[PDB]
Amino acid sequence: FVDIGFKVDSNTQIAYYTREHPDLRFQLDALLESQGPEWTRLFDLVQA
Amino acid sequence: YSDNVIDIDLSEDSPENYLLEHAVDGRMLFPATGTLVLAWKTLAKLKGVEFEQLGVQMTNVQIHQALFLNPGGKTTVSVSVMPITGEFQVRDGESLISSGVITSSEGRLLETDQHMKKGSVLDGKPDKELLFTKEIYREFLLRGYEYGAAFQGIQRASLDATDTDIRWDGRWISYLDTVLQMYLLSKPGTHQALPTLLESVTIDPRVHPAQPPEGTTEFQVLPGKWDPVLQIAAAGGVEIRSCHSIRASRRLNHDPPILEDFAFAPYVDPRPSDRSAAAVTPALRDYADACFEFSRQGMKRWLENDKNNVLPNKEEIKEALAMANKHANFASAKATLEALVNNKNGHRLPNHGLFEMLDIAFSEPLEGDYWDRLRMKLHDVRTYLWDDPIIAALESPDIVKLVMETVSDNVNQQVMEILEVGAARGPYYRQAIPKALEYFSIKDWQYTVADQGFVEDAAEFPVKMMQFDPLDPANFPAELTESCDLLVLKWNLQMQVDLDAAITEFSKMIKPGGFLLVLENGTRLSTFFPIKAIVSASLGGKGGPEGDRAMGCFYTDAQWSALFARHGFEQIMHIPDGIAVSMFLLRKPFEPSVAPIIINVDDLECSWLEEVQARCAELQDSHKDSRLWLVANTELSGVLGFLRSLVWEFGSEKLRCIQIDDATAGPNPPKISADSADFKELVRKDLAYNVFKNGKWGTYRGFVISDADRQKERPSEYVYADWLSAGDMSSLRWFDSPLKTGHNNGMLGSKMAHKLETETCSVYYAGLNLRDIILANGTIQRDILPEETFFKEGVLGVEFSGRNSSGKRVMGLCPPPALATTVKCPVSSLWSVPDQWTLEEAATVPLAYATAYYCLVSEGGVQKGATVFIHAGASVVGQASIAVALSYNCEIFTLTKNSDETALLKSMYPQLNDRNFCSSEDCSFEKYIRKETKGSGVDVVINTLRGKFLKASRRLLSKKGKFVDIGFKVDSNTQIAYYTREHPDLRFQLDALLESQGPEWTRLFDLVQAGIHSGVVKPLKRAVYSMDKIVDAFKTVEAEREAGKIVIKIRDEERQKVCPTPRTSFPAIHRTCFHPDKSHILVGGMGGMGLETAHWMVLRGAKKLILTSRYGITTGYQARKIAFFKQLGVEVEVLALSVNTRKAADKVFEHALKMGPVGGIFNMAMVLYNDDFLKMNREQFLKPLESKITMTMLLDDKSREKPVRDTLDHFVMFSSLIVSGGHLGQANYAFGSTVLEKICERRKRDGLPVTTPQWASIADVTIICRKYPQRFFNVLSVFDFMMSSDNVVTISYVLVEKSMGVAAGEESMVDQVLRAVGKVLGIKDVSSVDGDKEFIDMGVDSLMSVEIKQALERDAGLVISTKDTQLMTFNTLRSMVKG
Amino acid sequence: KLKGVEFEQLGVQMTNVQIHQALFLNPGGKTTVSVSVMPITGEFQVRDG
Amino acid sequence: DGFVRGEVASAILLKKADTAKRVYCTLVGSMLNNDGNQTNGILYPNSE
Ligand SMILES: NC(=O)c1ccc[n+]([C@@H]2O[C@H](COP(=O)([O-])OP(=O)(O)OC[C@H]3O[C@@H](n4cnc5c(N)ncnc54)[C@H](OP(=O)(O)O)[C@@H]3O)[C@@H](O)[C@H]2O)c1
């Protein structure tokens, strides 16, 4: 289940804070700051 | 001086009295969807709107408890709803009953469009394609859901139960329950499911029809639908979605059934193999000898030491010592007994009273006030003599029941009068009452103990105490003439100075045709004498023609019999103990004045029905001495049960029976024929039932089976561990394993799809995991496990280490039950034990390391050098996780409870330093681990702790960290997360991978195999428990007091490495199982008990059923059941035929052998025509005799021929308690039911399998003859015992309550109503207040007077005006209820 | 107050406290706020109007 | 079968007949008594 919506509920946000669930809606922005192994996998996938 | 407080008035005429019509196994319950309405009404009340104009939606409704309703009581429940969020709480007092979230709305909440459906799609269908309310609620009743007329909403449904017609009566609690019944009706089964979570409940009254007009009698039916795709039960404006239920242990409404063994018992001189023989074991015969030697030498010690001559009866003692010498140190005598007493070799008499009491007699000093003191001493331990193996040999339950019931069959009254003369010295009520008279249902009994004084020990028994001199005749009160039907003289005639005078006076108390029971010492008369020498005052008794009384108070058994015979007493029964006491049952000879009438009832075609009917009509117009003798000279004849039913309408005064069993009749068979010799001996005793079988005259009696024998353990080649009572770890036992048939129970449904290749392994060691303890102790129900294990015999044990079929040493994980002696392990789950590990060590590896690899390498994706946090490092999964993590060169942080665990881990893994250990007591590891990881966190978290520890664990996760939660005691919110797919449930994943054994498992199989080769997978430290300490092993695992693997040792590993496993047997409780490769015939299986028993066999192994009926499938209940068997994977076949001719019998077995070898024949067929015996012709008398006399010998003839004889395993022929108790109007049924039992007893004679249940009444499939009907779930529990037993006929019946007397009961009812009257006033103890004080003196005021009057009318026949009520007394009240 | 004990003798723990609005005080004015606590679970709600 | 509760707040003025400016009627006499120990209960009228 890949949840990429932006308007998460209050309970959902608390789940993100408590590490209960991963926050995947600003991950492409986070991978662009590090630009590490995970990003280069997406760089190659898009290039291919 | 929180929200709406609702009061439920369960009163006589209150509008919500319909809520008492909702019970589960008797208990009245508030419907699970009843707190939904309370929350619904509360929310509307807060909004100020009318509740029927508000559309609500309840989500994730948790049912925590069950609100137990009480008739005529008021229940107050508090509903609290949070204003904005909707969190609601239905709570009774300070206990939560329901929780969830209630949300209202103005839009369309209902998902399905069912509220728009108008008509009923179940129109024009045949009656065999529909379920009606009787059929729908017969299925619920079988599962424990008892719904009254108010809650019977589903008026019609389809066979699939998808379409239904739901009644709308304006009561919302009823309507919501009837919509939840659709979900229940969609999950066929046998267990009782208690709802625990309703994910969504939508109520929209706006689309719902309005309440019916006032006073409506006929209500409308709203179409309902069940949606399997979405799991929605929708009808009208209601919708229930994804209801989750928890298995509930079915409680017994009544008391446990009384199981008996309907067997034959000789009258006189029973042989050791007979059931009326004294229960003298070899151990008892030793204790008797030891006591005899101790008594003999003790008297010698008495005589020599009696230098003060303070030992009266000294001449008597000398005489007693002399005879013992004729038929023959004190330290040794006590030594032998003490060795017997202190030994605990299993062979252990229940108690040693004679030794104990004798020791006090002899050890007491010889000095002043000796006899007076010692008399008092023995009178203080008198109980030892009463409750002693020697004395109790003749007081065994079998003999006591044989005597009491044999007398009852012959007394021709309604109340049985008993009289125990001399109840203070030798008591019998304490044995007769609890062993025989408390089982009476058809005949009432009155017991009267008598003695010189008040019988102290009889104060607690339902007996009447009289007063007169027992030791002196000629003073017996004249009020005792023709007073007792049975007279008991336990240890009385040995105290009479004049026997002839005593017996002559005693014989007057016997009613004409009454019995006399005498128990006296007859052998080894010098054994108990030392006690009687100093407990008796005048040890002098005149002798007589039979001889001279031994000492002065004892006659020998032979002399006892001659003495009784001399006074014209017929010896009805005589059971000599052999070691001590003897028993005689006597009644006066009967001299006929008119020649007896003999009718031969041998013919099974009933060519005599006309003659018996004519002679039975002329019974009440003939002389009182006329008798009708129904005589049978064949093994197969129903005269015994036929007569019992005739006695119910013609009285026992003139009906008598004689049956001679040809097969077992000795070399000198009786010659009962009119003016014969044997017959006259029988016309003198005038016994109702005479049966000559096994060479002796006797009678058929139902001997009770102790509740301990139901769980008796016997050797069994294949066994497995299960629980007797769910949720109890102390109830773990070893039951028979279905693997004796080669296969494993639970091959239905999803288990039929995965055709895994399995290797049959002989388990040697079984590892105990925490998964088993969680299931065993009730922390988790069986329903949480993979669905493939629902029908398995057990769910305990996965890992093991044994030997495959080729003798190789193997270890592996298998679907449960692996806590057994044989398993069928898939070949993809079996590892080979390296030739360096003993099988003991192999048993610890598989699960611990398979889980470790799954958590780390399969779910956590651990990489080299990663940081891993492992909870409970000392657990077997914890130890495996560390070993796997170390192999991956990880940085390990582990939680250790105490210092011992830390030391153990450090020694076990030298790479671990003190910096790698934390404490499980508090969440102080979070700061330590965060600091030690420099804020990076831990890559993998193997979590077992819960609560704040779980929260702190996730908080340590890195950005890419994985959280593997494998704890079992998840919270309610966590479980809802699992249900809603929010989180994956990883705590039963290793069990799920073992059912599929697919790509994911083979990854773990290779990982563990590689670890074994590379040395990573090393055996763990373990503690080995034997098979009998299974309970202790489970307790050890649960406590977790110390680290280690708990491994049950099933077998002893042989020295070799490839060798066949020796065949051995294990003690285990019975568990009936049916071969899945054999065909089982159920003739009459298409009915009430036929279809429900068939379902029981399907669960126990059967997969090939051929059900037979006269018409086949004719109702929607039969069509729905058969469609359920077929769906489960059962090859069913319904034959519309009657097996009454050889052609019909052949067809049934042609179809059976086509499906597979015949492995069971069941005959549940019944046809009844209840009518009076005299208004029945042959065509009507032979009605019940087809299904019981023609279908039992056509199934018995076919089962005695090849190939059925070799393959057949079970031959069950259901019967009725009419053959043991009789019934009114069912004289033809009794004849059929008895001849059926005689065929089944003939089968036992030939060594063939046979079982003949004798049921009284069955509830699910009221009080008749004072016997409650059993619940079916309990009928199958005793039926399972019936099949796995050696006896032929077993009688199962439930008693309303243990029988009391007649006056005893009457007084009980009196006290009951008196107390009701007293409580009306408010007096806790009615007897406490004065009996002469008027009610007005207490404060009775108008309202109470009317209440008292109504209570009296409802309780008794009195009708008292209000005015007299305030001026009458309790004593007056009692005397007037008596009048 | 619900427990009947004095508030300074009770040790509490509030978890996941969400602040949805700001309660604007007013000088020389009276502000009435309703606090609702669920008996057993502890769910509380400070709500003005 | 019973009575229905009511509400009243009445009051009257009594005066010597010689000094009264208005006389609705004259009070001939009033007296009181009790029932005693009746066997029908305390809340029961006593006809005697
Ligand atoms: N349940 C009780 O109340 C109770 C109490 C005590 C004892 N029992 C014992 O249990 C049995 C009765 O159970 P039940 O009546 O609840 O259910 P059941 O035994 O399945 O019902 C009797 C069935 O036998 C069939 N049958 C009658 N004559 C037949 C024939 N010639 N060939 C084949 N089938 C024939 C009938 O099928 P069709 O209807 O299709 O013709 C009927 O459905 C008897 O053995 C009885 O001794 C039951």
Keywords:
part of a larger assembly, 4 chains, 48 residues, mainly alpha, 3 helices, binds NADP nicotinamide-adenine-dinucleotide phosphate, biosynthetic protein, polyketide adenosyl transferase, beta-keto-synthase
Major sheet of chain A: size, sense and barrel closure? none
Q: What share of residues of chain A is helical?
A: 55-70%
Coarse structural class of chain A: mainly alpha
Main interface pair?
Answer: B-C, 12 and 8 residues
Number of separate strands of chain A? 0
Query: What small-molecule ligands were found?
Result: NADP nicotinamide-adenine-dinucleotide phosphate
Question: Looking at the structure, what is the overall shape of chain A?
Answer: elongated
Q: In oligomeric terms, what are we looking at? A: part of a larger assembly
* Terminal CA distance of chain A: 25 Å
Content of β-strand of chain A: under 5%
The secondary-structure element order of chain A is HHH
Number of separate helices of chain A = 3
Radius of gyration of chain A: 13 Å
PDB class: biosynthetic protein
Keywords: polyketide adenosyl transferase, beta-keto-synthase
Entry title: Full length EcPKS2 - malonylCoA inhibited dataset
Chains A, B, C, D: Polyketide synthase 2
